Ligand binder design. Structure first.
Ligand SMILES: O=c1ccc2cc(O)c(O)cc2o1
Ligand SMILES: O=c1ccc2cc(O)c(O)cc2o1
Ligand SMILES: Nc1nc2ccccc2[nH]1
Lengths: 188, 185
């Protein structure tokens, strides 16, 4: 990840005007849509939290959790820490990132700070559901001037995406003011 | 450097009781002694600053500044960023690190934050002297409980090193309370 840290603008875009900041969300959304498309029920939920973090959840299969034979860490960690631009770029430029994977009747949790895992991926409990959730706090050392998520920028893009991804429910929620939207195009 | 950032304790030592914190200084000192031995005057200066940073100067040749043909960046940056344990560990666990190299008539400067270079090594002026200086601010995210440098812990180790490295002068300076020592065999 040090290559991304050396020159963040090359990977995420402009870190001052807000375009790079919102690209962080849209990169994570693209990965969530890919997981949602693998299934039948397909739903993703994008939540803007009151602390200016954004979470993106899908109800897909859940990212692989088993140890990678070469790397010697969970396959999830490899996805989050090895260099669309990839979620690893978002992780590198996030001062905090929470990963939650529900898979094979188990809840898996891991926390990152500036791309560095704080502990190995851990099974913390049980669940009937499946899916992947990433909640990230953009790094205020990288992202300057525009540091708060504009609802309209996310709402507009998610609406455009709904028409290209048939059968995928996309929910947008703003916990700051309680505003929300539901984009669900079932064409074809 | 992310392997170091993942498990700092395994590389530097315990990050809560103050062992790791002081080992940061000792790792830098080892490299400063190597440079001091191969120069003329052979003196190192370890300064504890008021803002809880430590700087280690030597008056050696100055570490290489030219571009490394494999990595495509200054040889100094390769030393600071690629994995004695190495100063790259110290750089990785420092919230800020300032590198100053005097060599071939030129002063070179570079700043790091958590091991990430903020710009390439740059020529900032002219100079008659030679040597290398690293000033580092330990990351308070890594180093907890014992965050401030105890003078006697550094003094004890530098005394041991002065006997072992008989040709090298070792000066220790504390700017918080004005305390000083000069270890030389
Ligand atoms: O790299 C990946 C792969 C899948 C994925 C699914 C999510 O729902 C998400 O928020 C982030 C993700 O990142
Ligand atoms: O090769 C190296 C690497 C780090 C380093 C740090 C110092 O403080 C110094 O005086 C000399 C050094 O030489
Ligand atoms: N605050 C902060 N910034 C960082 C950049 C890289 C790795 C760790 C870091 N902690």
């Amino acid at each position: 990840l040090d290559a991304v840290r050396k020159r963040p603008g090359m990977y995420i875009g402009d870190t001052d005007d807000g375009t790079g900041l919102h690209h962080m969300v849209f990169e994570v959304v693209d990965n969530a849509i890919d997981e949602a498309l693998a299934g039948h029920c397909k739903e993703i939920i994008v939540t803007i939290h009151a602390d200016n973090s954004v979470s993106v959840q899908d109800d897909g299969r859940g990212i692989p959790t088993g140890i990678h034979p070469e790397e010697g860490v969970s396959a999830a960690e490899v996805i989050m820490t090895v260099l669309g631009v990839g979620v690893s770029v978002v992780n590198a430029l996030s001062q905090k990132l929470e990963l939650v994977i529900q898979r094979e009747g188990k809840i898996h949790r891991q926390i990152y700070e500036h791309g560095v895992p704080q502990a190995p991926l851990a099974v913390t409990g049980e669940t009937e559901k499946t899916g992947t959730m990433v909640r990230f706090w953009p790094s205020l050392e990288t992202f300057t001037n525009v540091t708060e998520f504009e609802y309209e920028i996310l709402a507009k893009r998610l609406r455009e995406l709904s028409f290209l991804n048939s059968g995928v429910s996309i929910r947008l929620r703003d916990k700051r003011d309680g505003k929300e939207d539901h984009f669900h195009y079932e064409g074809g």
